[PDB]
Amino acid sequence: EVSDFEILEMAVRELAIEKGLFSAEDHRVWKDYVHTLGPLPAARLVAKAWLDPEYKKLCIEDGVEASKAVGVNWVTSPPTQFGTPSDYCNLRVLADSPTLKHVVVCTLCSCYPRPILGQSPEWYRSPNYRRRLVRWPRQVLAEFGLQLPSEVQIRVADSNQKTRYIVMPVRPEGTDGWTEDQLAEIVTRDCLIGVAVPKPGITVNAKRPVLKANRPV
Amino acid sequence: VSDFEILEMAVRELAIEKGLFSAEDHRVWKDYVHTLGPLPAARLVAKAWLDPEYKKLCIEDGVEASKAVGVNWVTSPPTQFGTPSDYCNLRVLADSPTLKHVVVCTLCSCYPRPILGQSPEWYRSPNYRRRLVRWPRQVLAEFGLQLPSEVQIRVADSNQKTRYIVMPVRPEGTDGWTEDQLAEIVTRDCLIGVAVPKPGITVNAKRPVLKANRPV
Amino acid sequence: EVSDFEILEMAVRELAIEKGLFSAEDHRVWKDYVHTLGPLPAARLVAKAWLDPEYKKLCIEDGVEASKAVGVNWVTSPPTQFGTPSDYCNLRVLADSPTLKHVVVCTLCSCYPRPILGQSPEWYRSPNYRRRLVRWPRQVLAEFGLQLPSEVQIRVADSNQKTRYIVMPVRPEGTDGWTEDQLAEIVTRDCLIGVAVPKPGITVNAKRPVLKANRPV
Amino acid sequence: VSDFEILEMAVRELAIEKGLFSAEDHRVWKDYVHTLGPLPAARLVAKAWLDPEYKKLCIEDGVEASKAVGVNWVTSPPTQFGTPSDYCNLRVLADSPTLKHVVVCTLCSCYPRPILGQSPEWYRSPNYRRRLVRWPRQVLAEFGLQLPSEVQIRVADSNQKTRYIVMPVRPEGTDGWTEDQLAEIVTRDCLIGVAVPKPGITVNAKRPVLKANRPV
Amino acid sequence: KPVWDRTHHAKMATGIGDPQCFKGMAGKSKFNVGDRVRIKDLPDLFYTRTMTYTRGATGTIVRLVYESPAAEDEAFGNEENVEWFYSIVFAQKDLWPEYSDTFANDTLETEIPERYLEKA
Amino acid sequence: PVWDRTHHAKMATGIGDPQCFKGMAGKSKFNVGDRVRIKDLPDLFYTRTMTYTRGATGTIVRLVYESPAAEDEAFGNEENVEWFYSIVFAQKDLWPEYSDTFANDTLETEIPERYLEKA
Amino acid sequence: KPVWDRTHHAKMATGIGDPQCFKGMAGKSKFNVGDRVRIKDLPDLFYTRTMTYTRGATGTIVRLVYESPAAEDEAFGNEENVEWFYSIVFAQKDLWPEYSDTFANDTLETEIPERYLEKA
Amino acid sequence: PVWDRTHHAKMATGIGDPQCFKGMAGKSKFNVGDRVRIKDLPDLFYTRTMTYTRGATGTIVRLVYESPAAEDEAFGNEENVEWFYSIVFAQKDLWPEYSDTFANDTLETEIPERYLEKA
Amino acid sequence: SSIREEVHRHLGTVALMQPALHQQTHAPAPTEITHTLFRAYTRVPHDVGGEADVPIEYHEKEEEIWELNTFATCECLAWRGVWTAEERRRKQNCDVGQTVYLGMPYYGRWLLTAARILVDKQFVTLTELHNKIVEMRERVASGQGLGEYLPP
Amino acid sequence: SSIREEVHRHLGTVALMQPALHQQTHAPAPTEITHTLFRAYTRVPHDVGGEADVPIEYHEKEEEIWELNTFATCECLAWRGVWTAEERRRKQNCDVGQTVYLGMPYYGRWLLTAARILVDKQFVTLTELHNKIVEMRERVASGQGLGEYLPP
Amino acid sequence: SSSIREEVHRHLGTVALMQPALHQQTHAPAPTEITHTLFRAYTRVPHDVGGEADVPIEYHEKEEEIWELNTFATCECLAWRGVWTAEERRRKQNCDVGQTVYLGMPYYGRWLLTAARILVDKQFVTLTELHNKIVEMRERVASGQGLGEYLPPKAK
Amino acid sequence: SIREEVHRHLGTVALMQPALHQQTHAPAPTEITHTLFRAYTRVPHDVGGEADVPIEYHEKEEEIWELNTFATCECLAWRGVWTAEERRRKQNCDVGQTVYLGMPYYGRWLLTAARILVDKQFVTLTELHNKIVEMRERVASGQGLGEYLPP
Ligand SMILES: [Co+3]
Ligand SMILES: [Co+3]
Ligand SMILES: [Co+3]
Ligand SMILES: [Co+3]
């Protein structure tokens, strides 16, 4: 039941290793690093910024420096020790406000802040999302169940170069006295991309269909 | 001269030659069409805003209410039995702070011609007919209209003999306005539901206009 | 399982009978008639014409009259007593000669001399055959394995009105002294359409793929 | 000027600027290309028709035989190692009463340029490349050429470094003809295989000619 | 050759209107306002005015709009049978799987002849 | 509306189609041997005169029979009957690319009188 | 014969990061925060990371993000030249003709290397 | 990275291509007259052994020359050289629909040794 | 402006090159028709509600003189009992078939169908319609004019 | 040969990927319809002679029991005067439209048109046809057989 | 019912296949048939899709395939070890592959093909070595020797 | 002319040939069959045996830019920039299915000539882009344009 993709994957990996381009160890190391990734660090960065005005300022001006606060050093955390080859080392945090709301996309591919947020959603990589968001953001966001006042500036950020973004949504009402953990808990991956906003009681991305893999990880 | 113009002449001459309908009938129908437009529907709305008893009639019996603005769905058309295509069952959909209507004919272009005039080119489009019923919020946003998420957006699909016009809620900033002033801001688009009346706005939103080869 | 086609066929047949359009007997009577059809009569007509110069003249000038000689009366053989509704009553026989070779098609549909030849081939009804024969007969015939001298007149007959045709090919070499039955035996359905010529020892149409039906007759 | 001409100059000037090749090299190659034509190939067939020994050489060693008509596949081109794209392995396919050849390059347009000139537009077409190898009888019939069913039609696909030219059989009606006269009827199309030589026919069959935007 | 009565409709509807001219011909309505009904997925070969998007969905009858022959019959010159027409309101979520819960109150209203209705 | 389901049978029983229309077209406008060009009449809704024959010139080789045109019969109109002709066209006159090598190839088909005009 | 320097990137960026390793290599920036610039429609044969939808549009520089070789060069192994990259904000109405005035404040932010910018 | 733009000219001048590769393939694995079947090797990225020949059997009629496989030459790898063979295929073995009427028709093309296996 | 126009023309042109698995249909056998395809092929063309479509900048369109005349003709034919609007819709928005339904203009279908009803109900023979079209074209071509469409 | 089988499957599959400039048509305005397109859209679908097409290995096909029943029904309807064969051809090979004409099977069109004539000439109401179809489906489901298409 | 609604949605999607169009196949047209607009469109960079019209779709998540993770790790390791930079990868992967493969194949299918591609283009492996490896991999599947974590060796 | 309209009609109706048109938008791996995988990973130039229609073959005058392009490609090979086999692989295969059949024969030759300059780093993509701008300005400024346009 082996597919042509799996056949080719083995061929490529074995050949690269035989020719000494990289070792079997390097490959396992990268996979291990990927397994350590997730959206929690980014969520905690937001919670911390909500609770600390000074840190929020740092997040806005220097995302790379701010990321260190949640244990994610864009330069030294990845195995390379020079940032991941594909995500680079220039994270920027986009702070929403009562008059500004951000949403992110990579129209050219799937550019995502993997080091601090984890792997990108399947739909984020879709030609559809990459075609539509930059031109009809209000409509796409509405499909995701998010609507903002017409006077609010919706800003779409297209990650087309070496910068990667995470969205710092506005802190919702009904979270007075909440701890850092309680706040971070409602800042889902979708909130960090910008297709959703944090809501008390909602601690998981909105449920959507899940396409099963032939041979899942 | 296009193939359409040739065929049109051929069909009309044959119909008249065979006595299916007369030259007079054809002229009379075109004359009737020329009298149509959005003014009577806009007036019905303004009248409803200024007269609660009339508003109640509009909501329960659109056909009867239409008479007050000079449009008798049965006798205004040349047939004396309503237009063959629009029929005689107008219903007025009244918006409220929690309900906003928008109309479409997914099967064609069904429109309340007697009281509203001719349908917009886009209203007849397969695109509008495919999308409005499923993604109304997105389509309306494209028209520049957005409503609170809790408000019930109701799409009305005119698929049988009923035709609809939308009675929008009266907007703020119209204190002491006369019937004429209120009617002025109830445009064709407001009556379809892709726009809401706003003081100072007395014409449909500007859109590209595709020119006809030989316009009326 | 029963297909959508079988569901509709049954609905149509029962409604027609119920409304008195035609009877259950009519339907059975027609199917029985179709079952009696085939290429044998037409093949005999050719065999007879090969052995009787006078009969050949009749075939060429009056196909309907000649057809009676082989037991097929285009007017009274069918259950209607006015010819079949779709095949009509004007059969014409096209006689090949050393300088003339015919091939038939119905570009508008599938028009075929059913009464004397039977049912049309699947390929004869194909949009492909209907599109190409009239314009590239040489190439199409070559595909069927039939080639003729460049100076021989290839004539394509398009059955677009009420006339139906059968091709009377030239008698092949090596048939000296053959009986009517022997000669008729090598005049296959394909020879009567014109995509093949009779050959001693060949008593069946060239073999070609056969698409199986879901529920065959 | 078209986008093609814009890019052509950009590429040529860039290549020369970076010293990849000189303006002189470019002029030299165009000059060489300008001298190419089908005559040498026609003369080779003519000589073979009159010299059984030469014909044997043609069939066994096309490269050697080509020298007899002034075309040295190795030294004639400006490179002194053959043209980069045509290589140096010409083979001559000799037709016979029971064998007739026709050539094509299904992968591209591979043609024996040194001895035949430039390839026909249709020879480079995806259509010719798709159909010839599978339906040769049909394609040839379209070209007006038909051969006995028992005759072996052999299609040659020039997919590697060998280039072919077809040596058709000498046609009837040429008794007593000189080499010069025989050469005149061996056209480019005969050398490809889509046509056969015929007395009195000294040019390829007339067919539509698509004009260029800026020829020369 | 067939003869087509070209005066029938006008004689029946003049001064009355369509569908007013069919009033009272359907008899007793099978359903009433407030009833919950499911749309039957009847065959639609050749013609139908009950959109595919409504098949199998359940809605609420908000009005008995009028009586009239079904379009499926009228479109082929058959007006012998008259039935009640109902205006039905569907929740958008019941029609489109992807509809967002954020817009939970959105609806769709359209008319359907009695033949396509069954108690929910 | 009543559709007569006995008309055709009453007209053709024991006679056949197109035999039942014999003599109804009157005098033929053309004869065997005449050169005729095919008129490009409107095809709207229906026609049995192939597009590939329009504007081409051929030779009448036979007056096959009399019958109402398919353009009328297909819509239940059989009041008018006309002559049908079998016409032979040279392939090179239909297809611009036809090879001179096969200069004798032809195509034969039937066309009602209404589509014909003197060459 | 060709040899590829597989250690160059690592030796240059280890412990520093990308694009940090190119800091100061672009020299003086041609533009500054607040400047209005129009995106030049440079040829994009084979490769470009400056979206077609931005060509000819005018926006405002809101930040000098970093220095780095242009993707057009880096993607073909040419890192000898380094230039400034700018984050630019465009008004949606200036990108899409149909954008509604109702949403007049909507914007789009993206990054573009200096070579594509010219004074507005 | 530097490219040796003089290599080809230096080894091919005054000799030609593929003449410059003569003798570098060693002893041929097959000879004229041998029956061979075309192996359906992976085509990823490039190949000059047409898909229509895969799995078909033909007859070697000539050892045309020696040369690096196109699969290698196209990517700058000319270190290995092999024999090229001209193979003749019966048309009926390539195309299922080929008519028996033209039972003698064939197709000839060249294939490097790597794709050949004794039939 | 000039660049923006090229940008938008480009965005529209690339749509023509959208890759696809394009399967031409040539009267396939019954065994190649699944239930899903059967239902899709026997669908009523006018029922498009819910089908996915893209966002388009809606435009208004001036009414052609022939469109107004066509509309009047269709309503007058109904007024005088040749047909009812429902019969028109069925023939006009469904019977025309998928290809003509989306390939031809809105009013083109109204006009074709008006001509259709005259022939289908035998008020005019197809011959009479065809001859009238020939006469009309000749009228235009000769220079004598064509009603309000072209002066003599 | 499994290899040859994959080769031929490959040659057939790549046809699906043949590049093209694909322009979807969505009710274009009258001004986008040239005379050439007007003629192409109003053509009778069955007139295909001369159209370019590829070589295909012609095959025979077994007759389905429903195809035989369909043919008999069509000829019996003609025999008993419901229609003439010409009326059938016009409705069956032309009125069905381009999409169904090449998308559905030969006998599928014959059958659809037999159902069509019953409704068009009002021998059966569309309601009766729709109801009958429901019946046939219920007959199959309930396991009550279906003629010789399925034993009860 | 659920089955009814399922058939309705299946219908709504199938009819899209029948959307009428003017379909013009292209077969190496002459230069004179190439307008400036067409020239710019054909020479476009495939990955630049922002702003193109598209329909609404119900976005879904997708489980990661073992081979996709392995492919991702391979691509980053090749970059980590200097075989290429991510930018070289993007250009080869999202642009050089061309329009047809770009939208016809899966996201990670392109990542994988391109990883194979860099090995050959930079001459770290010959195309011959790659082709032989693929054959070797297929033989493992057949021989029942299993292949990594995709399929274990023959059991009992 | 009637015949001209007839032939124009026959070609036009081809555009309306019905089909099941499935747009592809980066399908998931589970939607790719072995057959599709082999088809997508095919080498574009291998078209032998593919079904096609009969077409009236025509000759074509050579464009001056085509002659120059051919000379450039052969000169690049002559001077060792590449071999003809490397050209073929890049020109008839690497270009991809769409460009392969959508663009002109020599258009691919030219694009590939520009391609080798960049791929082997003899010129940077920036230099190529700048040059193109220069050529366009040269044409606009009326400064002439080789044998393609006088000053
Ligand atoms: Co990306
Ligand atoms: Co409507
Ligand atoms: Co027929
Ligand atoms: Co070639």
Which residue is it, tokens 């020994």? D53
Quote the minimal CA–CA distance from J96 to chain K in Å. Answer: 15
Q: What whole-number distance in Å separates Cα of residue L25 and Cα of residue K46?
A: 13
Phi, psi (deg, nearest 5) at residue G91: -85, 135
| CATH pick for E1-120 out of 2.30.30.50, 1.10.10.10, 1.10.760.10, 3.30.420.10 | 2.30.30.50
Is D133:D155 a contact under the CB 8 Å cutoff?
Answer: yes
Pick B126's closest partner by Cβ from J26, J35, J39. J26
* Residue type, position A103, single letter: V
Q: Tokens for A50?
A: 């909500």
Strands L19-23 and K21-25, bridge-based pairing: unpaired
| Architecture of the domain defined by L1-151 | Orthogonal Bundle (1.10)
Q: Tell if the CB–CB gap between C145 and H101 is shorter than 8 Å.
A: yes
d(CA B163, CA B174): 29
Catalytic residue status for B190: no
Name residues whose C-beta falls within 8 Å of residue H45's C-beta, 6 or more positions apart in sequence: K116, K117, K120, K127, K130, L43, L89, L93
Helix, strand, coil share of chain K (percent; to 5): 60, 5, 35
Tokens linked to L129: 């882009």
Which ligand places an atom closest to the C-alpha of K107? 1
Ligand nearest to the CA of D128: 4
Task: Identify the H or E element spanning H110.
Answer: strand H106-112
CB-based contact L38 A4, cutoff 8 Å: yes
> Tokens 């700058």, residue?
H76
J152, J145 in Cβ contact below 8 A? yes
* Ligand minimally distant from the alpha carbon of residue C111: 3
C25 in Cβ contact with J130 (< 8 Å): no
Whole-number Å distance, alpha carbon E115 to ligand 2 midpoint, is 22
**B55 contacts B48 by C-beta, under 8 angstroms:** yes
Domain boundaries, chain L: 1-151
Chain F residues whose beta carbon lies within 8 Å of the beta carbon of residue D146: 101
Chains J and H touch (3+ CB pairs under 8 A): yes
Q: Which fold has domain K1-156?
A: Cyclin A; domain 1 (1.10.472)
Judging contacts by C-beta atoms under 8 Å, the chain E residues touching residue I87 are 74-77
What DSSP letter does each residue of A64-133 carry, written as one string?
HHHHGGGT--TTTSSTTSS--TTT-SEEEEEE-BTTEEEEEE-TTS----HHHH-SPPTGGG-HHHHHHT
Name residues whose C-beta falls within 8 Å of residue K47's C-beta, 6 or more positions apart in sequence: A108, A109, K90, K94, K95, K102
Q: What is the resolution of this structure in A?
A: 2.0
CA angle (L61 as vertex; L60, L64 as ends), nearest 5: 135
* Chain J residues interacting with chain H (CB cutoff of 8 angstroms): 1-4, 6-8, 10-11, 55, 57
D22 carries a ligand binding annotation: no
Token reading at E111: 């008319």
Print the SS3 string covering chain J. Answer: CHHHHHHHHHHHHHHHHCCEEEEECCCCCHHHCCHHHHHHHCCCCCCCCCCCCCCCCCCEECCEHHHHHHHHHHHHHHHCCCCCHHHHHHHHHHHCHHHHHHHCCHHHHHHHHHHHHHHHCCCCCHHHHHHHHHHHHHHHHCCCCECECECC
- Cross-chain Cβ contact L123/D14 below 8 Å: yes
Nearest-Cα residue of chain G relative to residue L131: G43
Q: For chain K, how long is the longest CA-to-CA vector?
A: 67
Question: What was the structure determination method?
Answer: X-ray
Ligand positioned closest to the Cα atom of C112: 3
With a CB-CB cutoff of 8 Å, which residues 166-185 of chain C face chain F? Answer: none
Q: Which long-range contacts (CB under 8 A, 24 or more apart) does K7-14 make?
A: K7/E41, K7/I39, K8/E41, K8/E52, K8/E53, K8/E55, K8/E56, K9/E97, K10/I36, K11/E52, K11/I36, K11/I39, K11/I40, K11/I43, K12/E52, K12/E53, K12/I50, K12/I51, K12/I52, K13/I52, K14/I36, K14/I37, K14/I39, K14/I40
Encoded tokens for A169: 């949504």
> What is the CA(B20)–ligand 2 centre distance, in A?
25
F109/C80 Cβ within 8 A: no
Q: Which residues of A are annotated as a binding site for Co(3+)?
A: 106, 109-111
Residue with tokens 């300059």: L117
CB contact under 8 A, A11 and K130: yes
Nearest to F45 by CA among I74, B20, C110, I117: I117
Radius of gyration of chain L (CA): 21
Check F50 against J47: CB less than 8 A apart: yes
List chains adjacent to chain H, taking adjacency as at least 3 C-beta pairs closer than 8 Å.
Answer: C, D, G, J, K, L
Specify whether the CB–CB gap between B166 and B188 falls below 8 A: no
Helix (H, G, I), strand (E, B) or coil at L72: helix
Task: Say yes or no for a CB contact (<8 Å) between F40 and L10.
Answer: no
Q: Are chains H and L touching, using the cut-off of 8 Å on CB pairs and a minimum of 3 such pairs? A: yes
Residue type, C170: V
Active-site residue among C106, C120, C126, C150?
C106
User: Is the sign of the CA dihedral A10, A14, A17, A23 positive or negative?
Assistant: positive
> Helix, strand or coil for residue C165?
strand
Fold of A1-217: Nitrile Hydratase; Chain A (3.90.330)
What is the dotted CATH code of the domain comprising H1-119?
2.30.30.50
- Minimum CA–CA partner of I120 in chain F: F75
Q: Does domain B1-216 have CATH number 3.90.330.10?
A: yes
Query: So where are chain H's domains?
Result: 1-119
CA–CA dist B160, B191 (Å, integer): 19
Q: Could you say which residues from 130 to 169 on chain D have a Cβ atom under 8 Å away from some Cβ of chain L?
A: 130-131, 133-134, 138, 142-143, 157
Q: How far apart are CA K85 and CA H84, in angstroms?
A: 39
Helices (H), chain I: 2-13, 35-41, 65-79, 85-90, 97-103, 106-120, 126-142
CB contact under 8 A, G76 and L124: yes
Contacts of L74 in chain H (CB under 8 A): none
**Is L132 in the D-facing interface, judged by CB distances under 8 Å?**
yes
Minimal-distance CA residue of chain A relative to E96: A143
The one-letter amino acid code at J80 reads: R
Is E52's CB within 8 Å of I86's CB?
A: no
Structural contact between residues J27 and I105, judged by C-beta atoms closer than 8 angstroms? yes
- Asked if residue C106 belongs to a known ligand binding site, the reply is yes
Q: Report the distance separating Cα B50 and Cα B58, nearest Å.
A: 13
Single-letter residue type at L119: D
Map out the domains of chain B as residue ranges: 1-216
CATH topology for the J1-152 domain: Cyclin A; domain 1 (1.10.472)
